[PDB]
Design a protein around this ligand. Structure first.
Ligand SMILES: NC(=O)CCCC[C@@H](S)CCS
Ligand SMILES: NC(=O)CCCC[C@@H](S)CCS
Ligand SMILES: NC(=O)CCCC[C@@H](S)CCS
Lengths: 243, 243, 243
């Protein structure tokens, strides 16, 4: 690929060189390796989380007793685990022969933690088997270890899918990058109150923005519109996971 | 381009290998070839289809008599054909010398059909010359042949532009991939009722999401904002095609 | 990277070859060089410009006296200059050793002008030091020289960031391409009146769409959600720049 020409930046004004941590360097290399290997498409969708929210907030007692804090990440993780099992091509990877997909029969999911040294993406194993408070507890442990450079490579491995949540900072949507060899990553941005047509008038409903990027060689356009559709349906009534 | 390292996926749990149809393999190869050749930009726009819809639904009698079913795809195809003629750089391809564009004086348009064996994109020729019921009939023939593996390579050739409609499944917008050597592809997602400001109050209007990806080497940012603008104008009052 | 196969386009109908200006050729080459070097992410956000607008329009007298026309571009430029100083990683470039960032202590910003010969991106130097009418005057000079092929290479150099505004043509959002070796570009599309929840009811507020693309090797997902957040905050009350 042609390089970018060097520029004497100091011709235009004062410059200063600060260097990158090896963590940044790693991160930089893996992203570019994904960018060039994966033909990327992003599917956007909004889910009605008005009831999910009200539930989150009512179980604040139970979660405080249990020592965890229930955010939207456990709810996101449980629903994606259920869907990674309904729609298995999302839970798979392209075999290196380019002629097969390796369907994984396990559901471990990673999630992005941005630490000062760089991006780390700790993996929770067997998301399909743990409960909302279990996942809430674990998510939090892994994140603190991640910030404290006390997370060990063991825990950064063999994930099937990634959730990257910027909802706590803001933004309307983004186009995340597939963390190859995985085939899809779900970006979650900030919830807003929004008018939604109820057949007769507009009701305010709390809407969560979802931005699913995928490896188009393995997932086609309709498979992906269907994944974000099912997920917005699950998040609107999480009781369907009981079914 | 550096490869992705192989991972022994079975270290993390049970895996299973299912293989790809040659159709998937083809599809995979062409997408990646586009991804690396075309610097991609996506322009988003929403069109007011409230009147187009009401028309669609009133001609249901006529279409049933004629044996076709009138969906939004014939209306999309007619308007894009008209615009591919108004704005010709969208109807062209970059000559392989990299120093010229081959402007095509014909308008054949392909459309994406997702079949079980993979993605197929049958082409309707001379869209500019056929009527809404003609295109409705033809769209449907080609799609059934496509699902039935009875579509022949003849019919997958020399298109100028592509429409990829996921509207029937859902989603808010997506970033489709230019089907090189074409220079643009129009993605259409699900229509929603939306409040639209009428200078004094918000009216509910049925809004169709449009996501136009283009080859930025041939189309610049303003040419593309102008194409989606004209198209939202045409779809708001399709009678302008008579002009 | 594999090439795209040549197609005898004339098998399908009449074609015509028109050639590209060297300006297009240049533009084409630089875009593709960016596309393959920069792993791109786009962050979307909307800013409430209702008060900024009303201000713009009240200073129409002053601007007419001063011979300039105050559009949104000076307001965009002043706020980005302030932020390129608050959040310095946006004002930097990746050193060619891949192991360092060159932080630039200057703020010159380029902006995209689409001329008939191709795209040109004149640079305003030391945006941080000039006032709204200064920048309004200058923006306009550079743009006319650009359209008149009277802009000289001097003026197309050593920018730190780019603003690409298609707001005057239309569109809802787009994904612009980082103009490498810069690390981010802000796309601005068309403002619309929109219902915004005020805790009790929806108020109409004039909303400006912002689409920030960045080089993910240098800027992480949260740094970028924070830049578009601060910018929507600055544009909502530009007096915070006085602080
Ligand atoms: N851990 C890494 O080194 C790179 C992670 C890349 C994949 C995702 S988090 C990109 C999100 S925009
Ligand atoms: N027919 C193919 O083999 C690939 C088609 C690629 C172009 C479009 S449909 C991608 C849409 S996201
Ligand atoms: N001046 C050039 O030759 C290319 C500019 C590329 C960067 C930006 S303007 C792309 C915007 S979509």
């Amino acid at each position: 690929i042609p390089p970018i020409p060097p520029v004497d930046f100091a011709k235009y004004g004062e410059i200063e060189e600060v260097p990158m941590t090896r963590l940044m360097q790693i991160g930089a290399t893996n992203l570019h390796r994904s960018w060039l290997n994966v033909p990327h498409v992003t599917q956007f969708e909004s889910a009605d989380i008005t009831e999910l929210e009200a539930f989150r907030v009512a179980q604040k007692a139970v979660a405080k007793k249990a020592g965890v804090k229930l955010t939207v990440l456990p709810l996101l993780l449980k629903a994606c685990a259920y869907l990674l099992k309904e729609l298995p091509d999302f839970n798979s990877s392209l075999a290196p022969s380019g002629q097969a997909l390796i369907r994984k029969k396990y559901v471990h999911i990673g999630f992005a933690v941005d630490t000062p040294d760089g991006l780390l993406v700790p993996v929770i194993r067997n998301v399909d088997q743990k409960s909302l408070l279990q996942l809430a507890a674990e998510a939090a442990e892994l994140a603190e270890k991640a910030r404290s450079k006390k997370l060990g490579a063991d825990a950064m491995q063999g994930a099937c899918f990634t959730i990257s949540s910027l909802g706590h900072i803001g933004g309307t949507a983004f186009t995340p990058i597939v963390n190859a060899p995985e085939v899809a990553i779900l970006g979650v941005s900030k919830a807003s109150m929004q008018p939604v047509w109820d057949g007769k008038a507009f009701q305010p409903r709390l809407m969560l923005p979802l931005s699913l990027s995928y490896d188009h060689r393995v997932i086609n356009g309709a498979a992906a519109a269907r994944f974000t559709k099912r997920l917005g349906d699950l998040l609107a009534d999480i009781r369907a996971i009981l079914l």
